[PDB]
Write a protein that binds this ligand. Structure first.
Ligand code: FAV
Length: 837
């Protein structure tokens, strides 16, 4: 291995945030096996991709243009302004015209074809055989009444993407020798609980006798289970837990080579913090100095893995079972029906999760029958892709490789635009995989390597978890390395630049962070001190430019140091502004970015992403709620970036121009921020729509009860919530908001009626996607929050979506929710100030 390759691994290590060649916290080679296993998948995808399309990464969709967007196009013509260079002309185009076609109706229309259209000031390209109405940037401009400005330039050199060349029928038993902890900080008793699990299902449980809890407790006792070795399903975990529940650790009973685990193990455990994905991890606690450890012995030898049509009425019970929601509990009777009528079940794709949860994973013969069932998968293969259904099969309830692989099989047909909508959830679902190398992990690798925008985001989503998840950083580091090794030198160089910038901002944040206090900073001393620290960086080691992490198409240049500062909040985040490093930009507007240290931004990324998914759902129903999910990216441990939405203030700040509350303050602000009455009327309309979206969206997620200071509005009428990092009211619809809609005091009016109608329409559009939302919500709680109870926490969403009711009871239910808010007025808002004292 050339000394060159070592310098390179060192580079990857710094991009990753973890050293994948570190073998301090392993007890086998699953991780190395996986690094070698992912070489093939990576190389195959690198060799399959088109160098040109990969270089320009056009962002496209197959979805039809929504009704509400055709409205802005009734002349069947679209005007593209080509600016190359210092000259320019506006060209009318047809929604079906291809970029190369409008280049034909150009070149000849004026009068060398080695050119391409690029969005001004962005690294965004309009290329490939696709109708222009099918480009996201084109739709983004229409939704915002913006003009489409493009520049004619030379295609990027694919050379810049060069990839560096690479080079027994016995019963199961386990002996628990003992446990050891360095320091015990009332003497309690302690015992060990051993479980055999599969898909969060205890097939067998054994306990040791209780013993005095001392720094070292020994048993030397065999725990014999009823399950036979031959019966162990692949992917089963031996879950070991210490009760006084204090600590846990897991060990895959069958390894990545299909071999039964054997030998001595000394496992360092995870301590419970006073149900979640972290509990299923096969990784051990990296902290060997201060953790509990448990020693065991496994002696097990083997090398395993070597015309009844339904009566009319049972069929009704079956269909009833199938229609229930993902959270409905399956009775023993239900499972027996699903299983007995296996072949009937296999004809309803929606039954797949319920049915596979009816399998006795602890019986070799049954698992075998299950694979037989899966063999004739015709119905499933021809079913229309149902994301909600595919995801149910990737959660904690399914440990079977084959069952999860057919889920992944359906994802294979998603277009890039959809992978982007679900990427973050798919990356989180890698946590439910029992092995490091898996079909889902390979799918993320492959889609990332096929596309620059997916790879860019895939990078940050993996780095965010690697930096702050001890339970999964090892598996995610291997996935990230595999991707880094095939994205190409150009991307590699881009990531390096982003990492240096954020690494420098930590240092600045941290040095600044020492001079400070809680609730009020001031310190004209520290701000003068900030500008100096930035000035020092500005010359270098801070790169000329870098891609904005949450808006990769944007290149930030030099800092506009005079506009930078430290924000006045509990945490002392930086408010940075940069010049755009693209001269072709269509403006002089700086790029604002809030960089913050001290908080885990992953809950906010997660929330924002679900908001983006709710928007896409509404799009499929021809609705636009005008939500505003601003960029947010967790970039490292307790640190990350946030987009500064331009021309925006806090709804509280507006009121503060304390504690009393006036209804017209908001309308006055908006009327005053409007250049014309026309713009003011548009702002009023836009507020109504955005207000409705946040009311529906926020209620469903059960994050509707917010303080005025966590809600903002743009001068253009766009309302939007912020800071999602973790009497009552379902959501916020205060008197001032009502006033803008022309109502007050249990009144009504055309905009207000328009509000209720949109809300209702928005609400029921989400109910047609009830299962998708439920599975995203529960996956979110398991993989993003603390130890959340499945039974009660996850059930909230079921009640909110009012599962079990028809449309009429639904409309009524939401309308009442709007009424509760009305009755409450300013009550709730006003009450928070006192909680502080
Ligand atoms: C958590 N947190 C946020 O989530 C923000 C989200 C946005 C912010 S702060 C913001 C501020 C000013 C102008 C535009 C903005 O866009 C959206 C936050 C709150 C207060 C101070 C700093 C931050 Cl990063």
């Amino acid at each position: 291995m050339s000394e060159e390759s070592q310098a390179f691994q060192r580079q990857l290590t710094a991009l990753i945030g973890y050293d994948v060649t570190d073998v301090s916290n392993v007890h086998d080679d699953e991780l190395e096996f996986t690094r070698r296993g992912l070489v093939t998948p990576r190389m195959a995808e690198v060799a399959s991709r088109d160098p040109k399309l990969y270089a320009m990464h056009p962002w496209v969709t197959s979805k039809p243009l929504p009704e509400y967007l055709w409205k802005k196009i009734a002349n069947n013509c679209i005007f593209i302004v080509i600016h190359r260079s210092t000259t320019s002309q506006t060209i009318k185009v047809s929604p079906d015209d291809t970029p190369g076609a409008i280049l034909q109706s150009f070149f000849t229309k004026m009068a060398e074809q080695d050119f391409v259209l690029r969005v001004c000031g962005r690294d965004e390209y309009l290329v490939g055989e696709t109708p222009i109405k099918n480009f996201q940037w084109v739709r983004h401009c229409l939704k915002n009444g913006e003009e489409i400005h493009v520049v004619l330039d030379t295609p990027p050199d694919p050379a810049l993407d060069e990839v560096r060349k690479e080079e027994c029928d016995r019963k199961f038993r386990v002996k628990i020798r003992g446990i050891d902890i360095p320091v015990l900080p009332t003497d309690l008793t302690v015992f060990v609980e051993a479980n055999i699990q599969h898909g969060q299902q205890v097939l067998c449980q054994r306990r040791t006798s209780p013993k005095p809890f001392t720094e070292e407790v020994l048993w030397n006792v065999w725990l014999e289970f009823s399950i036979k070795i031959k019966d162990l399903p692949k992917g089963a975990l031996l879950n070991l837990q210490i009760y006084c529940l204090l600590y846990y650790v897991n060990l895959l009973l069958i390894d990545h080579r299909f071999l039964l685990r054997r030998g001595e193990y000394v496992l360092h455990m995870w301590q419970i913090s006073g149900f979640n994905a972290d509990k299923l991890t096969s990784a051990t606690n990296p902290d060997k100095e201060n953790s509990m450890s448990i020693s065991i012995l496994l002696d097990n030898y083997c090398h395993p893995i070597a015309r009844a049509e339904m009566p009319n009425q049972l069929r009704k019970q079956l269909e009833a079972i199938i229609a229930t929601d993902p959270l409905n509990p399956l009775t023993a009777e239900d499972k027996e029906l699903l299983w007995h009528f296996r072949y009937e079940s296999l004809k309803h794709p929606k039954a797949y999760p319920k049915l596979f949860s009816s399998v006795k994973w602890g019986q070799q013969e049954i698992v075998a029958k299950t694979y037989q069932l899966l063999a004739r998968r015709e119905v499933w293969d021809q079913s229309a892709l149902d994301v909600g259904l595919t995801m149910q099969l990737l959660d904690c309830n399914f440990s079977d490789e084959n069952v999860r692989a057919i889920a992944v099989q359906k994802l294979e047909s998603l277009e890039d635009d959809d992978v982007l909508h679900y990427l973050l959830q798919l990356v989180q679902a890698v946590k439910f995989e029992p092995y490091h190398d898996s079909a889902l992990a390979r799918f993320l690798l492959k889609r990332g390597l096929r596309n620059k925008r997916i790879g860019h985001f895939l990078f940050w989503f993996l780095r965010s978890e690697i930096a702050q998840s001890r339970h999964y950083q090892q598996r995610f580091a291997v996935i990230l390395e595999a991707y880094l090794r095939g994205c190409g030198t150009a991307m590699l160089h881009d990531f390096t630049q982003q990492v240096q910038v954020i690494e420098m901002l930590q240092k600045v944040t941290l040095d600044i962070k020492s001079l400070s206090a809680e609730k009020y900073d001031v310190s004209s001393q520290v701000i003068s001190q900030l500008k100096q620290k930035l000035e020092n960086l500005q010359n270098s080691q801070l790169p000329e430019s870098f891609r904005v992490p949450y808006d990769p198409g944007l290149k930030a240049g030099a800092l506009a140091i005079e506009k930078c500062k430290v924000m006045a909040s509990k945490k002392k985040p930086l408010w940075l502004e940069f010049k755009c490093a693209d001269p072709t930009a269509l403006s002089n507007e700086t790029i604002g970015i809030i960089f913050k240290h001290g908080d885990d931004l992953r809950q906010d990324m997660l929330i924002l992403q679900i908001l983006r998914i709710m928007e896409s759902i509404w799009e499929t129903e021809s609705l636009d709620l005008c939500l505003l999910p601003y960029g947010c990216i967790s970039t490292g441990d307790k640190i990350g970036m946030i987009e500064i939405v331009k021309d925006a203030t806090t709804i509280a700040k507006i009121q503060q121009s304390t504690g009393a509350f006036k209804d017209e303050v908001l309308n006055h602000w908006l009327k005053e921020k409007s250049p014309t009455e026309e713009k003011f009327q548009a702002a009023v309309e836009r507020f109504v729509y955005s207000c409705a979206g946040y009311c529906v969206a926020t209620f469903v997620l059960g994050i509707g009860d917010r303080h005025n200071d966590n809600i903002m509005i743009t001068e253009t009428g766009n309302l939007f919530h912020i800071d999602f990092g973790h009497e009552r009211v379902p959501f916020v619809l205060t008197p001032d908001f009502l006033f803008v809609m022309g109502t007050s005091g249990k009144k009504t009016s055309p905009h207000f009626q328009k509000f209720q109608d949109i809300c209702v329409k928005a609400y029921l559009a989400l109910r047609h996607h009830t299962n998708l939302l439920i599975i995203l919500f529960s996956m979110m709680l398991m993989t993003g929050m603390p130890q959340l109870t499945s039974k009660e926490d996850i059930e909230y969403i079921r009640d909110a979506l009012t599962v079990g009711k028809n449309e009429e009871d639904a409309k009524k239910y939401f309308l009442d929710q709007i009424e509760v808010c009305r009755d409450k007025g300013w009550t709730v808002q006003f009450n928070w100030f006192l909680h502080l004292v």
